[PDB]
Design a protein around this ligand. Structure first.
Ligand SMILES: *[C@@H]1O[C@H](CO)[C@@H](O)[C@H](O)[C@H]1NC(C)=O
Ligand SMILES: *C(=O)c1ccc(NC(=N)N)cc1
Ligand SMILES: [Ca+2]
Lengths: 130, 240
């Protein structure tokens, strides 16, 4: 019995758009920033893994929506395409014909732009020296 | 901070002084204009009520923290699985009534992302107004010092901390001592620089004494608490 704890739900019920835990923990941590280059990643319930988001057709309102999902509210700093350094082999591509952020993406083994989204929701980590 | 040096303006713009009864109690880290990362042991009862607390940002000297410069705390959230006995999951969040204005003096630190690939002995910094010697008084000036990460397996050796380091904990400092956080630094930042960005990898939690050999500082593993932090900010974002 494959399962994930809500503190136990089934994998396909984690990040599927329907809240199965009493507090909604199965649907409120499906987007994340990966690595020192802030690679935007989305959890796939089918493959039980995190996949980077292609730069294809990505715009700032999509990044703002991702920033809201992460709990940063209206904070938004930047969004640009970069080369993936997360070592991923599968990616989430945006489907134009759509819906929610995590529900508008589909799996793909390449990005047309050859780039993944690098998303920074807040200007942080900068001090006096460089 | 023991064995460190006084901080320059804008050197640690995320460092915040948390006050109760016109007195510095603990440190904190700005991550958003409203949210501050601090230690759960700092907000144990009776200081779990938010109206006891005032945050001071962008000010290096305690005597310069005048009446009217501080930000009233609106909300205090302790980690649900915090254990006072073991200091496990020693993390808490503070939300301000009024958001901070960001400038070269007051800026947030970045929450750690998964896949940081930090070195086992990664170079880090700690800062705060803690005592500069064990059992000493709160320091007037903000201090800071360099410390190295200590692998948990080495830290859990019977000769260091004997299996008291949980996966929600990281050790930093020097096994020889002489450079360590101290009383009053708790809740403050343990930061590291990678990809020209300062990351908050730890919040000052506890240690055996100060700067003692084979008793380095123990810090809350902010990477583990990242999921909980995002949920709290978001939950407050949807309003309560
Ligand atoms: C994209 O949207 C279209 C229209 O609904 C749909 O046919 C298709 O399956 C979606 N995803 C993929 C994998 O193209
Ligand atoms: C908090 O005030 C605090 C944190 C950690 C220590 N111990 C050591 N760094 N050794 C003391 C006090
Ligand atoms: Ca679900």
């Amino acid at each position: 019995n494959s399962g994930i704890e809500c503190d136990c739900i089934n994998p396909s019920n984690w990040c599927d758009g329907v809240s199965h835990c009493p507090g909604g923990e199965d649907e409120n941590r499906c987007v994340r920033l990966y690595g020192p280059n802030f690679i935007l990643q989305v959890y796939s319930s089918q493959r039980k893994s995190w996949h980077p988001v292609c730069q294809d057709d990505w715009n700032e309102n999509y990044g703002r929506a991702a920033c809201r999902d992460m709990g940063y509210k209206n904070n938004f700093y930047s969004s640009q395409g970069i080369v993936d350094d997360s070592g991923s082999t599968s990616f989430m591509k945006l489907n134009t014909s759509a819906v929610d952020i995590y529900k508008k993406l589909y799996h793909s083994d390449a990005c047309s732009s050859k780039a993944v989204v690098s998303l920074r929701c807040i200007a942080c980590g900068v001090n006096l020296n460089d | 901070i023991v064995g460190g040096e006084s901080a320059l303006p804008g050197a640690w713009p995320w460092q915040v002084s948390l006050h109760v009864q016109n007195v510095h109690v603990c440190g904190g880290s700005i991550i958003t204009p409203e949210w501050i990362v601090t230690a759960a042991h700092c907000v144990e009862k009776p200081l779990n009520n938010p109206w006891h607390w005032t945050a001071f940002a962008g000010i290096l000297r305690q005597s310069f923290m005048f009446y009217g410069a501080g930000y009233q705390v609106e909300k205090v959230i302790s980690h649900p699985n915090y254990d006072s006995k073991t200091k496990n999951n020693d993390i808490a969040l503070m939300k301000l009534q009024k958001p901070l204005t960001f400038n070269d003096l007051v800026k947030p630190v970045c929450l750690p992302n998964p896949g940081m690939m930090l070195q086992p002995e990664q170079l880090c910094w700690i800062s705060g107004w803690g005592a500069t010697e064990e059992k000493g008084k709160t320091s007037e000036v903000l201090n800071a010092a360099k410390v190295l990460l200590i692998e948990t397996q080495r830290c859990n050796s019977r000769y260091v901390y004997d299996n008291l380091i949980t996966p929600a904990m990281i050790c930093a400092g020097f096994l020889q001592g002489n450079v360590d956080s101290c009383q009053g630094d708790s809740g403050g930042p343990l930061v590291t620089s990678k990809n020209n960005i300062w990351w908050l990898i730890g919040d000052t939690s506890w240690g055996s004494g100060c700067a003692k050999a084979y008793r380095p500082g123990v810090y809350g593993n902010v990477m583990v608490f990242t999921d909980w932090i995002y949920r709290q900010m978001r939950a407050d974002g949807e309003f309560v």
